[PDB]
DNA sequence: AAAGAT
DNA sequence: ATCTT
DNA sequence: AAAGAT
DNA sequence: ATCTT
């Protein structure tokens, strides 16, 4: 399927290629920086060709946002199924050590999920799936050699500011947690768990509807959430007692 | 000087080289996407070897932040004079049509300008200069050929998601404006002007003391500033009548 | 965690 | 770190 | 703008 | 878009 082929194409591409710099039309190579600002961008770009290849294979049109900061990174669909679109969003995070618990910021909980056409490429109700392709890497620290340029012949000599990169594809609602991923920018935090948990989908919500009801009614601050709900068991009580 | 060779070197690098993609150790190249998320990352990495080379030519040590979310992109100082540090921060913005007035978000007004050691690599009082390396580029819609990968023999035909990139170096305070650059992330907004004004320094503050005093006493919300000041004029009047 | 930093 | 509305 | 989105 | 305190 599209989904099983995508997952496999992403495991293999990440297995076979290591990004090591940005290159210019004249052949000069600039090394990468070590922060997630930089690597977040590199993994999404790395991902574009793979996603397009699989999506065409499965007869799906791929469309990146035409406008800035409009979700999702990739909208796939068949023209014969206009309201059965698939949203795919890239997310990156780092670990200080290999194999420990990781957590992603999954987008706003006050934009399109509370308003059908806010910050989204196509109205929300036209999407049947929302997939997250998550990347995890182990930070490394940039050396003095990351401040020089290189040519196409010194490629394996460029230092990479990461090691142990892992990638997964899973449904947004499945990996969604119950604590905000950011404050002033109101993002849904994902579960905080090991890589296998994301791949396998050991989440906390019972269904995508519970995922949606919970993030749609989550208050922005802690005083406001204080006596409504702050986590899923309190939300389940809240539901139980008549949403009050 | 360091400053003048750097401005010269940034102008020349930008003229001679055109960033067209990210390359892997194995030689495969992934094209660039069109948002400022991809391009501010690309320009910053592009600027790294340049900054470092001119800094070494002048006897300055170059340090990038060791922690994420810390200003500035580069700290330069001569080992003989550690309390004479220079901050160089890269910023990017875009244009829809060549020229057109541009504006930049220039960092928070509530972190290090308000607390000597907050979100800054070295205490604020050890820096005697804060430069802004600013890039502007005209947006260009990405083509379908952006979704294919390339080899080192096709570098000249990889489509670029930009055109007309210009670069300048200028003191932060000279180009600062008097209106917030962002709301929830409380950034100083730069003046809104044409590229030439940035290069030339046609700002609004009379001095760096006034720039600092203004952004240090700037209130976060419209309602709060309304009893104090929402602009440069109101601020001079405020100053005039005894800071009330 | 929040809440507020790049 | 910077953009949209 | 201001305020709040990626 | 994600991270630090
Ligand atoms: Mn993304
Ligand atoms: Mn919109
Ligand atoms: Mn930076
Ligand atoms: Mn920067
Ligand atoms: Mn403008
Ligand atoms: Mn710190």
Coordinates of C-alpha atoms (C1' of nucleotides) and ligand atoms in Angstrom, one line a residue:
Chain A
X1 CA 0.0 0.0 0.0
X2 CA 0.9 3.7 -0.2
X3 CA 1.6 3.6 3.5
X4 CA 3.6 0.4 3.6
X5 CA 5.7 1.5 0.7
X6 CA 6.3 4.9 2.1
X7 CA 7.5 3.6 5.4
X8 CA 9.9 1.2 3.6
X9 CA 11.1 3.8 1.1
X10 CA 12.0 6.1 4.1
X11 CA 13.8 3.4 6.1
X12 CA 15.9 2.5 3.0
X13 CA 16.7 6.1 1.9
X14 CA 17.8 6.9 5.4
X15 CA 19.8 3.7 5.5
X16 CA 21.6 4.5 2.2
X17 CA 22.3 8.2 2.3
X18 CA 23.8 10.6 4.8
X19 CA 23.2 14.3 4.1
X20 CA 26.5 16.1 4.7
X21 CA 26.1 19.7 3.4
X22 CA 24.5 22.1 1.1
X23 CA 25.9 22.4 -2.4
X24 CA 26.0 25.2 -4.9
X25 CA 25.6 25.0 -8.7
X26 CA 29.3 25.6 -9.0
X27 CA 30.2 22.6 -6.9
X28 CA 31.2 24.3 -3.6
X29 CA 29.9 22.5 -0.4
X30 CA 29.0 24.2 2.9
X31 CA 28.8 22.0 6.0
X32 CA 25.7 21.6 8.2
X33 CA 25.1 23.2 11.6
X34 CA 24.2 21.0 14.7
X35 CA 20.9 22.4 15.9
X36 CA 17.4 21.2 15.1
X37 CA 16.7 24.4 13.2
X38 CA 19.2 23.1 10.6
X39 CA 18.5 19.4 10.7
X40 CA 14.7 19.8 10.8
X41 CA 15.1 21.5 7.4
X42 CA 17.5 18.9 6.0
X43 CA 15.2 15.9 6.9
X44 CA 12.1 17.5 5.3
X45 CA 14.0 18.2 2.1
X46 CA 15.6 14.7 2.1
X47 CA 12.1 13.4 2.4
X48 CA 10.4 15.3 -0.5
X49 CA 11.7 13.1 -3.4
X50 CA 10.9 9.8 -1.5
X51 CA 7.3 10.9 -0.7
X52 CA 6.7 12.0 -4.3
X53 CA 8.1 8.8 -5.9
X54 CA 5.8 6.6 -3.8
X55 CA 2.8 8.8 -4.1
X56 CA 3.0 8.9 -7.9
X57 CA 3.5 5.1 -8.0
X58 CA 0.2 4.8 -6.1
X59 CA -1.5 7.3 -8.4
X60 CA -1.6 10.3 -6.0
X61 CA -1.2 13.9 -6.7
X62 CA 1.3 15.5 -4.3
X63 CA 1.0 19.1 -3.4
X64 CA 3.2 21.2 -1.0
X65 CA 1.7 24.3 0.5
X66 CA 1.7 27.3 -2.0
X67 CA 1.6 29.5 1.1
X68 CA 3.9 29.9 4.2
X69 CA 3.1 28.3 7.5
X70 CA 0.0 26.5 6.3
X71 CA -0.1 22.8 7.3
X72 CA 0.6 20.1 6.0
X73 CA 4.1 19.6 4.4
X74 CA 2.5 17.3 1.9
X75 CA -1.1 16.8 0.7
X76 CA -1.6 13.6 -1.3
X77 CA -4.8 12.6 -3.2
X78 CA -6.4 11.1 -6.3
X79 CA -8.4 13.5 -8.4
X80 CA -11.2 10.9 -8.4
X81 CA -11.3 11.2 -4.6
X82 CA -11.2 14.9 -3.8
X83 CA -12.4 14.5 -0.2
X84 CA -10.2 11.6 0.7
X85 CA -7.0 13.5 1.0
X86 CA -4.0 12.4 3.0
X87 CA -1.9 14.9 5.1
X88 CA 1.7 14.1 5.7
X89 CA 3.8 16.3 8.1
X90 CA 7.5 16.0 8.9
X91 CA 8.6 16.5 12.5
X92 CA 12.1 16.2 14.0
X93 CA 13.6 15.9 17.5
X94 CA 16.9 15.0 19.1
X95 CA 18.3 12.9 21.9
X96 CA 21.5 13.4 23.8
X97 CA 22.1 9.7 23.9
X98 CA 21.2 7.0 21.5
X99 CA 18.0 5.1 22.2
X100 CA 16.4 7.3 25.0
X101 CA 12.8 8.7 25.2
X102 CA 11.8 11.3 22.6
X103 CA 8.9 13.8 22.2
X104 CA 7.7 15.8 19.2
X105 CA 5.8 19.0 18.8
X106 CA 2.9 18.1 16.5
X107 CA 1.5 21.4 15.3
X108 CA -1.1 23.8 16.8
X109 CA -4.1 22.7 18.8
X110 CA -5.8 26.0 18.0
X111 CA -5.6 26.4 14.2
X112 CA -7.2 24.0 11.8
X113 CA -8.4 21.5 14.3
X114 CA -10.7 24.2 15.8
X115 CA -11.3 26.0 12.5
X116 CA -11.8 24.2 9.2
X117 CA -9.8 26.5 6.9
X118 CA -7.2 28.1 9.4
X119 CA -3.6 27.6 8.4
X120 CA -4.3 24.6 6.3
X121 CA -3.8 24.0 2.5
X122 CA -7.2 22.4 2.0
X123 CA -10.2 22.6 4.5
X124 CA -9.7 20.2 7.4
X125 CA -12.8 18.1 6.6
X126 CA -11.3 17.0 3.2
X127 CA -8.5 15.0 4.9
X128 CA -9.1 11.3 5.9
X129 CA -5.6 10.6 7.3
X130 CA -3.0 12.8 9.0
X131 CA 0.4 11.1 9.0
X132 CA 3.6 12.2 10.8
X133 CA 7.0 11.2 9.5
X134 CA 9.2 11.7 12.6
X135 CA 12.9 11.9 12.5
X136 CA 15.1 11.4 15.6
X137 CA 18.9 12.1 15.7
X138 CA 21.6 12.1 18.3
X139 CA 23.3 15.5 18.7
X140 CA 27.0 15.7 18.0
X141 CA 28.7 19.2 18.4
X142 CA 30.2 21.1 15.5
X143 CA 34.0 21.1 15.1
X144 CA 36.3 23.7 13.6
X145 CA 36.3 21.7 10.4
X146 CA 32.5 22.4 9.9
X147 CA 33.6 26.1 9.2
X148 CA 35.5 25.4 6.0
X149 CA 34.1 24.7 2.5
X150 CA 34.7 21.6 0.4
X151 CA 34.5 20.3 -3.1
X152 CA 32.7 17.2 -4.6
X153 CA 36.0 15.2 -3.9
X154 CA 36.0 15.6 -0.1
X155 CA 32.5 14.4 0.6
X156 CA 33.2 11.6 3.0
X157 CA 35.6 14.1 4.7
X158 CA 32.8 16.5 5.8
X159 CA 31.9 16.2 9.4
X160 CA 28.1 15.5 10.1
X161 CA 26.6 17.1 13.2
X162 CA 24.5 14.0 14.0
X163 CA 24.7 10.3 14.3
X164 CA 22.1 7.5 14.7
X165 CA 19.2 9.0 12.7
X166 CA 16.0 7.0 12.8
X167 CA 12.7 7.7 10.9
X168 CA 9.1 6.5 11.5
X169 CA 5.7 7.1 9.9
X170 CA 2.6 6.9 12.0
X171 CA -0.8 8.5 12.4
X172 CA -0.9 11.8 14.2
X173 CA -3.7 10.9 16.6
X174 CA -2.0 7.6 17.5
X175 CA 1.2 9.3 18.7
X176 CA -0.5 12.4 20.2
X177 CA 0.1 12.9 24.0
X178 CA -2.1 14.7 26.6
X179 CA 0.4 17.6 27.5
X180 CA 1.1 20.6 25.3
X181 CA 4.3 20.5 23.2
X182 CA 4.7 24.3 23.5
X183 CA 3.3 27.1 25.4
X184 CA 3.2 30.5 23.7
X185 CA 2.7 28.7 20.4
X186 CA 0.1 26.2 21.7
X187 CA 1.3 22.9 20.1
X188 CA 0.0 19.4 20.8
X189 CA 2.9 17.5 22.5
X190 CA 3.3 13.8 21.4
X191 CA 3.7 10.9 23.8
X192 CA 7.2 10.9 25.5
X193 CA 8.4 7.4 24.7
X194 CA 11.0 5.2 22.9
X195 CA 11.3 5.1 19.1
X196 CA 9.7 1.6 19.0
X197 CA 6.6 3.0 20.7
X198 CA 6.1 5.5 17.9
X199 CA 6.6 2.9 15.1
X200 CA 4.3 0.5 16.8
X201 CA 1.8 3.1 17.9
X202 CA 1.6 2.6 21.6
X203 CA -0.4 5.8 22.2
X204 CA -2.8 6.9 24.8
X205 CA -6.0 7.9 23.0
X206 CA -8.7 5.4 22.3
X207 CA -9.7 6.8 19.0
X208 CA -9.0 9.7 16.7
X209 CA -12.3 11.3 17.9
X210 CA -11.1 11.2 21.5
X211 CA -7.8 12.7 20.2
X212 CA -9.7 15.5 18.6
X213 CA -12.2 16.2 21.4
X214 CA -9.4 16.4 23.9
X215 CA -7.2 18.9 21.9
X216 CA -10.2 20.9 20.9
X217 CA -11.2 21.5 24.5
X218 CA -7.7 21.8 26.1
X219 CA -7.4 25.3 27.7
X220 CA -4.3 27.3 26.7
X221 CA -3.0 27.9 30.2
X222 CA -2.6 26.0 33.4
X223 CA -4.9 28.2 35.5
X224 CA -7.6 27.8 32.8
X225 CA -7.0 24.0 32.6
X226 CA -6.7 23.7 36.4
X227 CA -10.2 22.6 37.0
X228 CA -11.3 21.3 33.6
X229 CA -8.6 18.7 32.8
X230 CA -4.8 18.7 32.5
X231 CA -4.2 15.1 31.3
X232 CA -6.3 12.2 29.7
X233 CA -7.5 10.6 32.9
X234 CA -8.9 14.0 34.1
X235 CA -10.4 14.5 30.6
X236 CA -12.0 11.1 30.8
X237 CA -13.5 12.1 34.2
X238 CA -14.6 15.4 32.7
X239 CA -16.4 13.5 29.9
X240 CA -17.9 11.1 32.5
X241 CA -19.4 13.9 34.6
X242 CA -21.0 15.8 31.7
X243 CA -18.2 18.0 30.4
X244 CA -18.0 20.2 33.5
Chain B
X1 CA 38.7 46.2 8.9
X2 CA 37.0 43.0 10.0
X3 CA 33.7 44.7 9.3
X4 CA 34.6 45.9 5.8
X5 CA 36.4 42.7 4.6
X6 CA 33.3 40.7 5.9
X7 CA 30.8 42.9 4.0
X8 CA 33.0 42.6 0.9
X9 CA 33.4 38.8 1.3
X10 CA 29.6 38.4 1.8
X11 CA 28.9 40.3 -1.3
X12 CA 31.4 38.4 -3.4
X13 CA 30.5 34.8 -2.1
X14 CA 26.8 35.6 -2.8
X15 CA 27.8 36.8 -6.4
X16 CA 29.9 33.7 -7.2
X17 CA 27.9 31.0 -5.6
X18 CA 24.3 29.8 -5.9
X19 CA 23.1 27.3 -3.3
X20 CA 21.0 24.7 -5.2
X21 CA 20.5 21.7 -2.9
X22 CA 21.7 19.5 -0.1
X23 CA 24.2 16.7 -1.0
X24 CA 24.8 13.4 0.6
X25 CA 28.1 11.7 1.3
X26 CA 27.2 9.3 -1.4
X27 CA 26.8 12.1 -4.0
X28 CA 23.0 12.2 -4.3
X29 CA 21.5 15.8 -4.2
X30 CA 18.0 16.8 -3.0
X31 CA 16.6 20.1 -4.2
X32 CA 15.6 23.1 -2.1
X33 CA 12.0 24.0 -1.1
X34 CA 10.6 27.5 -1.4
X35 CA 9.7 28.7 2.2
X36 CA 11.8 31.1 4.4
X37 CA 12.2 28.0 6.7
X38 CA 14.4 26.4 4.1
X39 CA 16.1 29.5 3.0
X40 CA 17.0 31.1 6.3
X41 CA 18.6 27.8 7.1
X42 CA 20.5 27.8 3.8
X43 CA 21.8 31.4 4.1
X44 CA 23.0 30.9 7.6
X45 CA 25.0 27.8 6.7
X46 CA 26.3 29.6 3.5
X47 CA 27.5 32.5 5.7
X48 CA 29.4 30.2 8.2
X49 CA 32.7 29.6 6.4
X50 CA 32.8 33.3 5.2
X51 CA 32.4 34.6 8.7
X52 CA 35.0 32.3 10.1
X53 CA 37.6 33.0 7.2
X54 CA 37.4 36.8 7.6
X55 CA 37.5 36.5 11.4
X56 CA 40.6 34.4 11.2
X57 CA 42.2 36.8 8.8
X58 CA 41.8 39.4 11.5
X59 CA 42.8 37.5 14.6
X60 CA 39.3 36.9 16.0
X61 CA 38.1 33.7 17.6
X62 CA 34.7 32.4 16.3
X63 CA 32.2 30.7 18.5
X64 CA 28.7 29.5 17.7
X65 CA 26.2 28.7 20.4
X66 CA 26.8 25.4 22.3
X67 CA 23.1 25.4 23.4
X68 CA 20.1 25.7 21.1
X69 CA 17.9 28.9 21.5
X70 CA 20.8 31.1 22.4
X71 CA 21.8 34.3 20.7
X72 CA 23.9 35.2 18.7
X73 CA 24.7 33.0 15.6
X74 CA 28.4 34.0 16.0
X75 CA 30.4 35.5 18.8
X76 CA 33.8 36.9 17.7
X77 CA 36.5 38.3 20.0
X78 CA 40.2 38.7 20.1
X79 CA 41.7 36.5 22.9
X80 CA 43.6 39.5 24.2
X81 CA 40.4 41.5 24.8
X82 CA 37.7 39.1 25.9
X83 CA 35.2 41.8 27.1
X84 CA 35.2 43.3 23.6
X85 CA 32.9 40.8 21.9
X86 CA 31.1 41.1 18.7
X87 CA 27.7 39.4 18.0
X88 CA 26.8 38.6 14.5
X89 CA 23.3 37.3 13.9
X90 CA 21.9 36.2 10.5
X91 CA 18.3 37.1 9.5
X92 CA 16.4 36.4 6.3
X93 CA 13.3 37.7 4.8
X94 CA 11.6 37.6 1.4
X95 CA 10.1 39.7 -1.3
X96 CA 7.4 38.8 -3.8
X97 CA 8.6 41.2 -6.4
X98 CA 12.1 42.5 -6.9
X99 CA 12.7 45.5 -4.5
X100 CA 9.5 46.2 -2.6
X101 CA 9.9 47.2 1.0
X102 CA 11.3 44.5 3.3
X103 CA 11.1 44.0 7.1
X104 CA 13.0 41.6 9.5
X105 CA 12.3 40.1 12.9
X106 CA 15.4 40.9 14.9
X107 CA 15.2 38.8 18.0
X108 CA 13.3 39.1 21.3
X109 CA 13.1 42.3 23.4
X110 CA 12.5 40.5 26.6
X111 CA 15.5 38.1 26.9
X112 CA 19.1 39.3 26.9
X113 CA 18.4 43.1 26.4
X114 CA 16.4 42.7 29.7
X115 CA 18.6 40.2 31.6
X116 CA 22.3 40.1 31.2
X117 CA 22.6 36.3 30.9
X118 CA 19.3 35.2 29.4
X119 CA 19.3 33.3 26.0
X120 CA 22.7 34.6 25.1
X121 CA 26.1 32.7 24.8
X122 CA 28.1 35.2 26.9
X123 CA 26.7 37.9 29.2
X124 CA 25.2 40.9 27.3
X125 CA 27.6 43.3 28.9
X126 CA 30.7 41.6 27.3
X127 CA 29.5 42.6 23.7
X128 CA 30.5 46.0 22.3
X129 CA 28.8 45.4 19.0
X130 CA 25.8 43.6 17.6
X131 CA 25.7 43.1 13.8
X132 CA 22.9 41.8 11.7
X133 CA 23.8 39.9 8.4
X134 CA 20.6 40.2 6.6
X135 CA 19.5 38.3 3.4
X136 CA 16.5 39.0 1.1
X137 CA 15.4 37.0 -1.8
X138 CA 12.5 37.1 -4.2
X139 CA 10.2 34.1 -3.9
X140 CA 9.9 31.6 -6.8
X141 CA 7.3 28.8 -6.9
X142 CA 8.9 25.3 -6.8
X143 CA 8.5 23.3 -9.9
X144 CA 7.8 19.5 -10.2
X145 CA 11.5 19.0 -11.1
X146 CA 12.1 19.9 -7.4
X147 CA 10.8 16.5 -6.5
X148 CA 13.5 14.4 -8.2
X149 CA 17.0 13.9 -7.0
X150 CA 20.2 14.8 -8.9
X151 CA 23.8 13.8 -9.4
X152 CA 26.9 16.0 -9.3
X153 CA 26.8 16.3 -13.1
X154 CA 23.4 18.1 -13.1
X155 CA 24.1 20.9 -10.5
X156 CA 23.4 23.6 -13.1
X157 CA 19.9 22.3 -13.9
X158 CA 18.5 21.8 -10.4
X159 CA 15.7 24.5 -10.1
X160 CA 16.2 27.1 -7.4
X161 CA 13.3 28.4 -5.2
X162 CA 14.5 31.9 -5.2
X163 CA 16.1 34.7 -7.3
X164 CA 17.8 38.0 -6.7
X165 CA 19.2 37.3 -3.2
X166 CA 20.9 40.4 -1.7
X167 CA 22.9 40.5 1.5
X168 CA 23.9 43.3 3.9
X169 CA 25.7 43.7 7.2
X170 CA 24.5 46.5 9.5
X171 CA 24.4 47.3 13.3
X172 CA 21.3 45.9 14.9
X173 CA 20.3 49.3 16.5
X174 CA 20.6 51.2 13.2
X175 CA 18.1 49.0 11.4
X176 CA 15.7 48.5 14.4
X177 CA 12.2 49.9 14.1
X178 CA 9.7 50.8 16.8
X179 CA 6.9 48.2 16.1
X180 CA 7.0 44.6 17.3
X181 CA 8.3 42.1 14.7
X182 CA 6.2 39.3 16.2
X183 CA 3.5 39.1 19.0
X184 CA 3.5 35.8 21.0
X185 CA 7.4 35.6 20.5
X186 CA 8.0 39.3 21.4
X187 CA 10.5 40.2 18.7
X188 CA 12.0 43.6 17.9
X189 CA 10.7 44.6 14.4
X190 CA 13.3 46.2 12.0
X191 CA 12.4 49.3 9.9
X192 CA 10.2 48.5 6.9
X193 CA 12.2 49.9 3.9
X194 CA 14.0 49.0 0.7
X195 CA 17.2 47.0 0.7
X196 CA 19.3 50.3 0.1
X197 CA 18.1 51.8 3.4
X198 CA 19.5 48.8 5.3
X199 CA 22.9 48.9 3.6
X200 CA 23.0 52.7 4.2
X201 CA 21.6 52.8 7.7
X202 CA 18.6 55.1 7.3
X203 CA 16.9 54.0 10.5
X204 CA 14.8 55.8 13.1
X205 CA 16.7 55.7 16.3
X206 CA 19.0 58.6 17.0
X207 CA 21.4 56.3 19.0
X208 CA 22.0 52.8 20.3
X209 CA 21.1 54.1 23.9
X210 CA 17.7 55.2 22.6
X211 CA 17.1 51.9 20.7
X212 CA 17.9 49.9 23.9
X213 CA 15.9 52.2 26.1
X214 CA 12.9 51.9 23.8
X215 CA 12.8 48.1 23.5
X216 CA 13.6 47.6 27.2
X217 CA 10.6 49.7 28.1
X218 CA 8.3 48.5 25.3
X219 CA 5.1 46.9 26.7
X220 CA 4.0 43.4 25.3
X221 CA 0.4 44.1 24.3
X222 CA -1.6 47.0 22.6
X223 CA -3.5 47.7 25.7
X224 CA -0.5 47.9 27.9
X225 CA 1.6 50.1 25.7
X226 CA -1.4 52.5 25.3
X227 CA -0.7 54.2 28.6
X228 CA 3.0 54.3 27.7
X229 CA 4.0 54.3 24.1
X230 CA 3.2 52.4 20.8
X231 CA 5.8 54.2 18.7
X232 CA 9.1 56.3 18.5
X233 CA 7.2 59.6 18.7
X234 CA 5.1 58.7 21.7
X235 CA 8.3 57.4 23.3
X236 CA 10.2 60.7 22.8
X237 CA 7.2 62.5 24.3
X238 CA 7.2 60.0 27.1
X239 CA 10.9 60.6 27.7
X240 CA 10.4 64.3 27.5
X241 CA 7.7 64.5 30.1
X242 CA 9.9 62.5 32.6
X243 CA 9.3 58.9 31.7
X244 CA 5.5 58.9 32.5
Chain C
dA1 C1' 5.5 20.3 33.1
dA2 C1' 4.5 25.2 32.1
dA3 C1' 5.8 29.2 29.9
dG4 C1' 8.5 31.5 27.1
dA5 C1' 12.9 31.5 24.5
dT6 C1' 15.4 31.0 18.9
Chain D
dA1 C1' 13.2 32.2 13.4
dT2 C1' 9.8 34.6 10.5
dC3 C1' 5.4 34.7 8.6
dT4 C1' 0.2 35.4 7.9
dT5 C1' -4.1 37.7 8.7
Chain E
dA1 C1' -0.6 46.9 12.5
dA2 C1' -1.6 43.4 16.5
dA3 C1' -1.9 38.9 17.6
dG4 C1' -1.1 34.4 16.7
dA5 C1' 0.3 30.8 13.2
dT6 C1' 4.4 27.1 11.1
Chain F
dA1 C1' 9.2 24.8 14.0
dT2 C1' 11.3 22.9 18.5
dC3 C1' 13.8 23.8 22.4
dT4 C1' 15.3 25.5 27.3
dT5 C1' 14.5 26.8 31.9
Ligands
LIG1 MN1 7.2 19.8 9.0
LIG2 MN1 -5.0 30.6 5.0
LIG3 MN1 20.9 30.5 13.8
LIG4 MN1 20.0 33.7 12.9
LIG5 MN1 7.3 44.8 2.6
LIG6 MN1 21.2 29.8 28.9

